[PDB]
Design a protein around this ligand. Sequence first.
Ligand SMILES: [Zn+2]
Length: 266
Amino acid sequence: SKEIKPIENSIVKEIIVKEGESVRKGDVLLKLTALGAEADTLKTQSSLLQTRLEQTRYQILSRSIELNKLPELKLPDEPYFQNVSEEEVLRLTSLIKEQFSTWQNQKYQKELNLDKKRAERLTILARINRYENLSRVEKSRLDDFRSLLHKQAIAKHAVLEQENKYVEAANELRVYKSQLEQIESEILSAKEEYQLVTRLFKNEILDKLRQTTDNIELLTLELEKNEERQQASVIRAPVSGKVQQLKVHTEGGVVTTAETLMVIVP
Ligand SMILES: [Zn+2]
């Protein structure tokens, strides 16, 4: 007495009723899935898996920053990590290893420069000490010399050459002191270069981790829509009675909203 049509163009997921079967109002007759829903959901799920792999990547790298060494490169076994291919895991671990290696090498280069500057500073300090001691010695010998001038116990020539020696010592000292100031400045700059590497690495990891979080959020919303559309529609008997004129026996075939799948009499 009443015709049964699908609310939307779909695929016959399950045929529960047979021809001539008696059903009550509310009994399930047919379950349908909307066309193209499973493929869409599959796509969204794939994207989710990828984004989560990336999330794992940047989490591991952040941890490696905190440890200055890589943690164990394994996926946690959570339900979103149930359909991961060997290729995806390999790609993940390779990416992690390569980024960590590059970071470490950059650090080591800047640290190398810094250490070179430190060694140079040590050398400069040694020279400064040397010529300060030399300067003072020549100055004292010269002072002893030049008032022997005023008691005419020494030649002017000896005085001139001692003054020459002292002057050279003092000039060398001044030069190396200036060099000390400059190298100290360069050491400061080198420290800032060394620190900048890890600073930027840490920042970039935080940024990417945030991005993956946002992406997981949006993809989750899209997945929610997909799951809402994909969930099987159930057709329940609007009245109790007999199933007649059933024109559906193939699971997996297409039915349209204009098609009468069966009638329930009366
Ligand atoms: Zn001379």
